[PDB]
From Swiss-Prot, chains A, C:
Zofenoprilat inhibits Cys-Gly hydrolysis activity. It comes from Bos taurus (Bovine). The modification N6-succinyllysine is found at K26, K68, K420, K441, K454. The modification N6-acetyllysine is found at K420, K454. InterPro entries: Leucine_aapep/pepB, Macro_dom-like, Peptidase_M17_C, Peptidase_M17_leu_NH2_pept, Peptidase_M17_N. This is Cytosol aminopeptidase. Zn(2+) 3 binds at L167, M168, T170, R268. One of its GO terms (biological process) is proteolysis. The active site is at K259, R333. Pfam families: Peptidase_M17, Peptidase_M17_N. Belongs to the peptidase M17 family.
Length: 481, 162, 481
């Protein structure tokens, strides 16, 4: 009827199966084991072999390599590793069932119900919607029934990421500053009714004296929308929140300080800041976590025009500081100077802001880890441990006065959007944001390296990657528990 | 000189084609009352058949203002003047033939032509010098847009030349 | 006769002096205190005021701001801070005595004998030698006599850095692969007689099957010299060593994969890898530390010629692995594939290699910290704590399979010198070096961001910075104790 993804590990006496696999073997009377011998070598991690007709009801039994049984927290790679194995191995498996055009598939728990699910789902995602030529929409349910609460945690966690991936991925002619808000609000409210949304317009942002976010929007004729998310998880409402901020340039052309045509079509994902953290709240509300969280994301676009932000321009952020706007492409810095200032109104506990800010971050670490600066070692620890679990790494980066210094000397004004020199890119830019933050637990997460995937993460197909959404989710789970 | 330095230096979002004129006029009149100013608008420049200055302005949505300074220093009014002209692009982004992001924030001082000579008259009127001088400076901005000046374009200057 | 650098801090009731300062005040009968009032505001950190004729024997008494008395380990800035204050404050002071053309100066201990010395000396250094127009050569002795062992630790530590600064700084027509070795050997032997040097020539390197270092040298007509340093600190000779490796391209023009004329004259400091670690041993031997250390540094040059290394070239490193040489400017990677392989011969405990490898590192952190990758958290800790003390920061960077993967797929060969993509620069390059390392305590230190100083570090004048030499020294002190 449908396919099945089985798992196996490496040697002992004969490479052991995952118990779903062992079970299914006994069932076809050893002949899965038997054909595995006959087929070729053994399956190291992530490798895949497909055995037809072993079962009546399962034409295609794909067996995938799970690596070491006891594979675990790796001191170097900074993650759990079995999980990492399982994720690529059922991803590998599920993409084989999807190429066999099998619309539904059943999947080995593989000892970590959650991981096989985040594999099956992250693994299968595309963003098919605008091609009439699409792959089969395969349905992936668990195999078994003993462990359902964590496989659904898989499908949950993986989906909230897939959310961001479709929110980033979609062309910025479709996924606008409004349509992004429309979907989010819709996603947050279908997540829980303990939620309020505020797709605040130009008038309110004007009213908020958000000079800097506004200076940015004015290039396009597409409207600014400052978005406000709320989830009231806490039993006592009055618990002060955790506030997520996120940059939402739906399209970045650089503005007057205009980009090269070389791969500028990826700037449709310069709203990844906004998308990631939004998907995290949509997800923390599906988990319905005992915490009040607040999504804040200035959605607008960077374009050149007769009224676009010019080089040399001093503008006023909400907080009273002026900014020389020396480079119109350093604009997340300005959109974020204001929603950061607004974050403090909420009396937060943690202000995690996130953004696709600098290509320099990409030059830095580049899709390994999502670089995170933070005046909180406590906070750093927290994001990092969560990243160990989820596998979407995070690497601390420096928030040193050294860097502030460069941004702070300024011809016209109080702060400059680009620092004195070429060097230290993400640090300069994070140094600019701290000028707009007085809280003891702030975290900049520059996501410009994890904006995309090709092959680097196995279980993600090519296209917007939606990172580090699950590490953000997992952090708020653990902070709630 | 310091006048020109603040007139050049200030961001072209603040120091516009109008705000430049506002300050100058203010500075020229506080220099002497033997002065007239004319912050002539698009209609007058249109009227003047200043096709070429106009072709330039049309990129921005910020208004052109052709400025006219006067100082009547001469005892006999009818002494013909000394005339200063000065370019006043408050911001130059190159337009469609667009600049590099490398230090384009200095183009806020592409109105230095206009600023220098204007400061000179403001100054010659404080000195109250026995000469009639005339400040003339087309203030406008260069930007790219759906109606910006394109490459290949023949436009008509006042004098008949294309 | 001579000048004097006094220190003061911020308020209490009236801003306190350092006891040298207090003492010198009583001595001119309060009139230093008195004129300080008369002069202007108070002196915040690093600021400087110069009072003539307060003393008979001290025409110029410069007083410098020391910031907070109790200023200490900063959780964010990752350093001791009083030290950092004192360093810029007497540096500030000493450069005032040197502009007053006062050939000798006496200096306030400032509560940290060592720090005021590393300030006075790092602070005063230039590399005057090739101008006939030079500043006065001011002599900086301590003020006092109570704490002499640590001020000399200052002058020691600062000098070993100044060594590297002159070794980097000097034109690569003068400071060749041989003249670098000549000075080092000379500096190591005048440091202790418990030392051997080996300025091994092409024949020996040929003999060593150091195909990769050799492929690099062959562009120039200037000779390769693989250098071998030794210091036998250990009481029992047979204690296996700590081995420092260091890249020594005296000049990098990129080779056939040739650089831009824009500031290529700084590549005269692409031997900073070799210089830093060499200065560290010269220094650990002056300290005469109970450890055997081994300096290893392939000195040669990158030039274009009729016999220069070409793009596409597979060459053989000592260890048997081949390298596609796709970019002739990624050449530290090759010079280092071989001296890394040779490091294991010595049965080391720690293999710290150091190099000015990637401009990407500069894009990364950029003169804040010297990025360090290491398969040893233990080792990381060690370099980092040392950096807390010295102030020459170090930032861990990732050594993830992710990155290896990119370098490892290779058309022709076993390893490629540049990885698959533009992104993640220093990590790709460090991933290449680990392919040439099997030891449990290896550390790559990419020094490309700290190659230079302008103003970023206060107490260093503009020019080659010589970083992170004291953190390396301080690490081997602490590892010896
Ligand atoms: Mg941008
Ligand atoms: Mg090079
Ligand atoms: Zn952007
Ligand atoms: Zn090099």
């Amino acid at each position: 009827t449908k396919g099945l993804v089985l798992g196996i590990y490496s040697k002992e006496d004969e490479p052991q199966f995952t118990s779903a696999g062992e079970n299914f073997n006994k069932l076809v009377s050893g002949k899965l084991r038997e054909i595995l011998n006959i087929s070729g070598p053994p399956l190291k991690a992530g490798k895949t072999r497909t055995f037809y007709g072993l079962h009546e009801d399962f034409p295609s039994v794909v067996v995938v390599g799970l690596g070491k049984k006891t594979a675990g927290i790796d001191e170097q790679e900074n993650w759990h590793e079995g999980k990492e194995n399982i994720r690529a191995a059922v991803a590998a498996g599920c993409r084989q069932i999807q190429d066999l055009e099998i619309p539904s598939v059943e999947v080995d728990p593989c000892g970590d119900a959650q991981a096989a699910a985040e594999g099956a789902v992250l693994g299968l995602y595309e963003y098919d919607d605008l091609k009439q030529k699409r792959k089969v929409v395969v349905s992936a349910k668990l195999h078994g029934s003993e462990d359902q609460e964590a496989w659904q945690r898989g499908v949950l966690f993986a989906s909230g990421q897939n959310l961001a991936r479709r929110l980033m991925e979609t062309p910025a002619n479709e996924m606008t500053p409004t349509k992004f808000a429309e979907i989010v609000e819709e996603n947050l409210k279908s997540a829980s009714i303990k939620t309020d949304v505020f797709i605040r317009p130009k008038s309110w942002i004007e009213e908020q004296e958000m000079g800097s976010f506004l200076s940015v929007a004015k290039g396009s004729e597409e409207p600014p929308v400052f978005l406000e998310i709320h989830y009231k998880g806490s039993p006592n409402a009055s618990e002060p929140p955790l506030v997520f901020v996120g940059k939402g340039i739906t399209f970045d052309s650089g503005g007057i300080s205009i980009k090269a045509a070389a791969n500028m079509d990826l700037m449709r994902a310069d709203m990844g800041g906004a998308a990631t953290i939004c998907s995290a709240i949509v997800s923390a509300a599906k988990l319905d976590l005992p915490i009040n969280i607040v999504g804040l994301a200035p959605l607008c676009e960077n374009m050149p025009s007769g009224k676009a932000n010019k080089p040399g321009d001093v503008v006023r952020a909400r907080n009273g500081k002026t900014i020389q706007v020396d480079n119109t492409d350093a604009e997340g810095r300005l959109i974020l100077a204001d929603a950061l200032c607004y974050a403090h109104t909420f009396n937060p506990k943690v202000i995690i802001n996130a953004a696709t800010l600098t290509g320099a971050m990409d030059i830095a670490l580049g899709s390994g880890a999502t670089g995170v600066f933070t005046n909180s070692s406590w906070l750093w620890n927290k994001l990092f441990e969560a990243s160990i679990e989820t596998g979407d790494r995070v690497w601390r980066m420096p928030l040193f006065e050294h860097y502030t210094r460069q941004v702070i000397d300024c011809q016209l004004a109080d702060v400059n959007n680009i620092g004195k020199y070429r060097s230290a890119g993400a640090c300069t830019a994070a140094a600019f944001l701290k000028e707009f933050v007085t809280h003891p637990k702030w975290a900049h997460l520059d996501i410009a390296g994890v904006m995309t995937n090709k092959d680097e993460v196995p279980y993600l197909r090519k296209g917007m990657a939606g990172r580090p959404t699950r590490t953000l989710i997992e952090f708020l789970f653990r902070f709630s528990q």
